[PDB]
Design a protein around this ligand. Structure first.
Ligand SMILES: *C1O[C@H](CO)[C@@H](O[C@@H]2O[C@H](CO)[C@@H](O)[C@H](O)[C@H]2NC(C)=O)[C@H](O)[C@H]1NC(C)=O
Ligand SMILES: *[C@@H]1O[C@H](CO)[C@@H](O[C@@H]2O[C@H](CO)[C@@H](O)[C@H](O)[C@H]2NC(C)=O)[C@H](O)[C@H]1NC(C)=O
Ligand SMILES: [Mg+2]
Lengths: 84, 47, 48, 144, 48, 505, 108, 192
């Protein structure tokens, strides 16, 4: 077949990255349940930003919510290692 | 919902508003660089 | 070969850029008046 | 043949120093053809190989956003050619592709250098030109 | 910008009040939950 | 949360909605949530009293906490599995108030005198519902009676809030969070509300509620939650690097057995290797632990039959390393269980009068036994499942060691293959991966009753399938790996580790 | 350099920290090639095996010339004769885009 | 619409002040509240969920009364009405607890129901007649045993006629459905 044209492969790559974090969002939203109220405040604010970005397919929001949801995921991972 | 706004249920309110906090005690026993001990305290901020 | 470096200094935003080399009567390239030499790339944030 | 079939091409680079002794550490500046992405796992073999290294920040990104590649060689033989190779695949679906380029130099001297191009139709990758004595013209066009 | 609201206290004590706000076309929001004292009518007297 | 103590006296009340708002396949997912939960609680060795109530218009009590059968995890699982969705479908109400009063009757003592241990006893209530109660009064007022009965939150001097925890699960396709949030207990930094998507990835749900305060040092217990790292998946796994001049860098694996001790193979080291040249990292930190001494087995000799014509001799290839400073156990650092110990008895849920031979019968039957080891792929630890060839193919597993390089023309098979070696590898009954040489020294792990037991130590393999530092591409099928049986070296381990108080039989 | 001198009996050797940033003030990501050398009077002598290859991350890198490599570099095994002479460093840093290059020098 | 507000003060003293409100219906703009002595309740609501008699489809309406919001279903009979300050109380006798309740059933004694006095214009209840009612957990109010059932927008009231009024052709089918639902809810519950 004809190979995918220009932006179509790039937008699909961004959607696959956002889809990967949303699979463990329910795990991470849970994982803040035994953590401090800041993490639980941050992830539910950051979670809807990723959820809307995937279904709206806006490039600006899908870029920002990818790095935003990655940031709180790093904070949770450092929280769970420091809490033991 | 489908509209371009955060839904109300997952809006998380700020509620920790005390004026004075961090009433803690610590001892400088870190390795003295030129006689100076460098202590790192990772602390939560408030709302 | 010429090297054009494009810089993105957003803290959380990667950018979709159309970049184009213009036609030149003094320089031969794929850019002519009818057919333009343009590309579509993506720059990650805090990177070049 | 093992049902991995796609539009596939392989790029091979070789060089040799002409001086009286082996030249020391040199650097490979490689630019992809437009819409071409290298096969990652071939460069994994090259980076971990002896006398060879690829920088981490360049290496771990890879895939479609890889257009310029930086490869460091610790030595090149002066008697015979040193070589390496990796696969490339098109993903952009565009005609009149831009040719790629490979430039060689050393870290102590950038000025003495050498640069060759490549294209899947033109031998030196310099496309097509017309020239009468000293006066030359652009010619990457249809004939009429 | 200040947004006034009108309320009526119904029961004595340090009771809870909560408000929220969210912006359109961006996913930035804020909520404020504070408590204020509901005092029954009357005043301090320090007699001997 | 929930405290797990070996002196535990805990009542676990299980309430399940059976109304038409749930759906049978959500009801089955509700049951599968509870069965893995009951099994994970029984993996600690705590004996709670289970209560089982399914309700619709009217509650039906299946297991009462007063019965002696309430402390049997296997029986309560059998009673829960038999319950069908359409068992009381014809009464399809949602009367949560009467079910809480039934739980209130369970905790209620006769007359005015509670039995002793009422303040000792912990109480746990688990509810699964749609959040749409439609029959009976308000359910919240029975909880206030439960709060008043147990004297919780009614005194400033002794608040007693740590004795009651209430969790609510949102099951069914349609769910009301507002009723569910009011029903659930509300505590700081403790998750008590679960949604419909929370029913998947059960190990993460259990990780939030469980507090392992009194259960830190339990051997062979794994956190399998999706956010867990390699060391949540393997708390015992220790990475051992030997960097010495001329010899160069070499890496081997180990397994935590005590606060000061790690078990690994002996051929990774030698007598000439110094203690400062050996670095061990257990929890994954870049801070390598300093060691005190390495205890070689007394009967180990790599050059035992060197004058006869055998190049390397791998009999008794085990060693114990002593740390300079002891470890502190955690979620990523825990020892692995050793056979014929009191910890292994509590792990296998055996009576305490179980002998060392009875455990030997269960762990090593004369058959193909499921097992696993750990390997590295691009600096990340991963699991490899193998089979121990202890059955009729044990002789065929030993015979493929003739193809080992350097040992092709050695006549006697029983000389080089001692009874210490356990044999894995091959393609029968299933394809078993072969170790890299960096994988040497690791444990051979067998899984029984939600716990993990070590039965061997990784020794050597017939064909080095990982010669080009990668295990890439297929290899011949007669490549076997050998592992040192722990039952053979049990008197040496019991002699050395009786000072560590592991409870040897 | 951590210190603007070298003490001959320092077992660690001379440590030279690399800092690289764009002209407008943002951090440079790249890889540096650095070599050490010795200056005697007006004459400079180069040590060839002192070459190292370090990535420049967070706008920074660090390279050390050890005491053994310098003593292996010189053919004189006396540490006493090294006093009175001077060192120089020459570094070559290239971005991970590979489009520009800067050569710097610390000497004396 | 939200009422506005005017506050007066001086720059040297904010504490001594005065604040008045305004609304195009309310004189002081303070909306509507109910209060008995010191205990007050919110009242910016509809008087009750009044239906315009066209929905005689009781079979839909009674099946929708099995929704999870309903915390009591009672059959009552009004005895005596007394006006008061800003409210009026309706002394009713509870005949049977059809669904739920959350308190003791007792059955056969006086149970006081209270409405805002501005809701007399919406619907006037008449003494000695039977009435069928249902509400939710925020309707019953006060402290035990002086609990008070307050009539609000979520409360529903309809007259259950006497035996001779049922024999009229309009209340023929009406007394059927309310009588069947009485049997339907003390036998079958809700199937949700
Ligand atoms: C409870 O209902 C079933 C129980 O397994 C699941 O139903 C999902 O939802 C609809 C059916 O109503 C299907 O289209 C999905 O494919 C179902 N499966 C999924 C999401 O895995 C589900 O687990 C539960 N939730 C819902 C909303 O039905
Ligand atoms: C069981 O309950 C009692 C409540 O009477 C708890 O309080 C203790 O009571 C005994 C005797 O009345 C005192 O000696 C203790 O000092 C009390 N403990 C306190 C005040 O913390 C107690 O939790 C339990 N008593 C036991 C186990 O003897
Ligand atoms: Mg129901």
């Amino acid at each position: 077949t004809s190979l995918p044209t220009s932006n179509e492969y790039q937008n699909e790559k961004l959607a696959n990255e956002l889809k990967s974090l949303l699979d463990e969002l329910n795990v991470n939203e849970l994982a803040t349940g035994s953590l401090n109220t800041y993490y639980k405040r941050t992830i539910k604010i950051s979670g809807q930003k990723a959820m809307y970005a995937l279904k709206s397919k806006d490039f600006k929001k899908m870029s920002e919510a990818k790095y935003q949801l990655q940031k709180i995921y790093n904070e949770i991972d450092e929280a769970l290692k420091s809490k033991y | 919902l489908d509209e371009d706004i955060i839904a109300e249920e997952n809006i998380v309110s700020r509620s920790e508003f005390p004026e004075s906090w961090l009433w803690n005690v610590e001892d400088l026993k870190e390795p003295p660089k030129n006689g100076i001990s460098t202590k790192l305290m990772n602390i939560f901020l408030k709302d | 070969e010429i090297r054009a470096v494009l810089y993105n200094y957003r803290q959380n935003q990667e950018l979709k850029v159309r970049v184009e080399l213009l036609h030149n009567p003094a320089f031969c390239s794929l850019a002519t008046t009818k057919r333009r030499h343009q590309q579509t790339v993506t720059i990650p944030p805090k990177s070049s | 043949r093992p049902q991995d079939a796609k539009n596939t091409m392989i790029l091979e680079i070789c060089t040799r120093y002409r001086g009286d002794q082996d030249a020391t550490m040199s650097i490979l500046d490689i630019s992809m053809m437009t819409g071409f992405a290298p096969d990652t796992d071939d460069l994994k073999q090259l980076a971990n190989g002896v006398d060879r290294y690829i920088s981490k920040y360049e290496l771990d990104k890879a895939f479609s956003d890889r257009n310029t590649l930086i490869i460091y060689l610790d030595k090149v033989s002066h008697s015979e050619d040193d070589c390496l190779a990796f696969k490339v695949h098109q993903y952009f679906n565009v005609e009149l592709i831009q040719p790629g380029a490979v430039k060689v130099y050393a870290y102590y001297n950038l000025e003495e250098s050498c640069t060759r191009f490549y294209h899947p139709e033109k031998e030196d990758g310099k496309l097509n030109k017309l020239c009468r004595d000293e006066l030359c013209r652009c010619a990457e066009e249809n004939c009429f | 910008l200040s947004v006034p609201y009108v309320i009526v206290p119904l029961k004595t004590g340090l009771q809870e009040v909560e408000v929220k706000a969210a912006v359109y076309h961006h996913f930035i929001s804020d909520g404020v939950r504070k408590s204020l004292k509901v005092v029954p009518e009357g005043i301090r007297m320090n007699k001997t | 949360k929930i405290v797990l103590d070996p002196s535990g006296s805990m009542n676990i009340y299980l309430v399940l909605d059976g109304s038409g708002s749930i759906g049978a396949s959500n009801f089955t997912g509700a049951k599968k949530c509870l069965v893995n939960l009951i099994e994970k609680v029984a993996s600690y060795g705590v004996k709670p009293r289970y209560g089982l109530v399914t309700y619709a218009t009217y509650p039906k009590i299946w297991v009462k906490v007063s019965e002696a059968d309430s402390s049997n995890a296997d029986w309560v699982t059998k009673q829960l599995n038999e319950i069908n969705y359409e068992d009381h479908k014809l009464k399809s109400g949602t009367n949560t108030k009467k079910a809480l009063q039934a739980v209130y009757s369970m905790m209620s003592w006769p007359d005015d005198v509670p039995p002793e241990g009422w303040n000792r006893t912990r109480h746990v209530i688990i509810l699964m519902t749609d959040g749409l109660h439609n029959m009976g009064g308000d359910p919240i007022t029975v909880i206030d009676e439960i709060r008043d009965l147990l004297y919780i939150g009614k005194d400033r001097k002794n608040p007693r809030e740590d004795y009651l925890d209430v969790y609510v699960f949102g099951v069914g396709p349609l769910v009301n969070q507002v009723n569910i949030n009011a029903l659930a207990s509300k505590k700081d930094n403790e998750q008590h509300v679960f949604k419909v998507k929370d029913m998947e990835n059960l190990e993460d749900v259990f990780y939030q509620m469980i507090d392992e305060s009194q259960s830190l040092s339990l051997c062979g217990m794994v956190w399998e939650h999706r956010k867990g790292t390699d060391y949540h998946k393997q708390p015992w796994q220790a990475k051992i690097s030997v960097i010495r001049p001329s010899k160069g860098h070499e890496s081997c694996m180990g397994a935590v057995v005590s606060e000061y001790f790690v078990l690994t193979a002996a051929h990774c080291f030698t007598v000439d290797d110094k203690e400062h040249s050996i670095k061990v990292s257990v929890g994954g930190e870049k801070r390598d632990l300093e060691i005190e001494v390495v205890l070689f087995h007394p009967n180990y000799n790599i050059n035992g039959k060197k004058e006869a014509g055998i190049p390397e001799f791998y009999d008794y290839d085990v060693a114990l390393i002593k740390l300079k400073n002891k470890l502190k156990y955690g979620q990523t650092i825990r020892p692995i269980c050793l056979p014929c110990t009191e910890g292994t008895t509590r792990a296998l849920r055996l009576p305490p009068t179980t002998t060392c031979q009875q455990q030997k019968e269960e762990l090593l039957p004369a058959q193909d036994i499921k097992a696993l080891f750990v390997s590295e792929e691009e600096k990340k630890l991963t699991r490899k499942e193998v089979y121990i060839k202890n059955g009729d193919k044990k002789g065929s597993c030993e015979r493929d060691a003739q193809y080992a390089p350097g040992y092709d023309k050695v006549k006697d098979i029983s000389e080089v293959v001692t009874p210490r070696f356990l044999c894995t590898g091959g393609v029968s009954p299933y394809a078993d991966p072969n170790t890299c040489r960096g994988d040497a020294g690791g444990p051979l792990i067998v899984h029984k009753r939600s716990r993990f037991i070590q039965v061997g130590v990784i020794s050597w393999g017939v064909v080095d399938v990982c010669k080009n530092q990668k295990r890439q591409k297929q290899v011949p099928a007669h490549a076997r790996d050998f592992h040192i049986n722990l039952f053979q070296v049990l008197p040496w381990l019991k002699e050395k580790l009786q000072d560590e108080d592991l409870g040897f039989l | 350099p951590t210190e603007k001198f070298y003490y001959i009996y320092n077992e660690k050797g001379l440590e030279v920290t690399i800092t690289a940033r764009f002209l407008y003030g943002k951090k440079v990501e790249g890889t540096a090639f650095v070599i050490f050398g010795i200056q005697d009077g007006e004459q400079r002598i180069s040590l060839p095996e002192s070459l190292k290859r370090i990535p420049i991350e967070d706008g920074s890198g660090e390279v050390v010339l050890s005491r053994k490599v310098l003593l292996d570099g010189v053919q004189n095994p006396r540490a006493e004769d090294l006093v009175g002479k001077s060192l120089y460093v020459s570094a070559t840093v290239i971005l991970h885009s590979g489009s520009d290059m800067v050569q710097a020098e610390r000497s004396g | 619409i939200q009422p506005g507000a005017v506050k007066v003060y001086a720059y040297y003293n904010l504490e001594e002040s005065c604040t008045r409100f305004y609304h195009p219906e309310k004189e002081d703009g303070k909306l509507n509240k109910l209060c008995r002595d010191e205990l007050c309740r919110c009242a910016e609501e509809n008087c009750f969920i009044q239906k315009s008699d066209d929905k005689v489809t009781l079979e839909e309406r009674l099946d929708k009364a099995c929704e999870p919001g309903v915390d009591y279903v009672y059959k009552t009979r009004l005895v005596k009405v007394q006006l008061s300050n800003d409210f009026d109380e309706y002394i009713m006798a509870i005949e049977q607890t059809i669904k739920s309740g959350s308190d003791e059933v007792q059955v056969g004694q006086q149970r006081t129901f209270i409405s805002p006095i501005k809701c007399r214009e919406a619907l006037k209840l008449e003494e000695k007649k039977h009435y069928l009612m249902w509400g939710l957990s925020s309707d019953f109010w006060g402290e035990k045993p002086n609990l008070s059932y307050i009539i609000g927008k979520d409360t529903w009231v309809e007259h259950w006629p006497e035996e001779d009024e049922c024999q009229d052709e309009e209340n023929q089918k009406q007394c059927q459905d309310l009588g069947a639902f009485t049997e339907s809810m003390v036998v079958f519950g809700c199937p949700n």
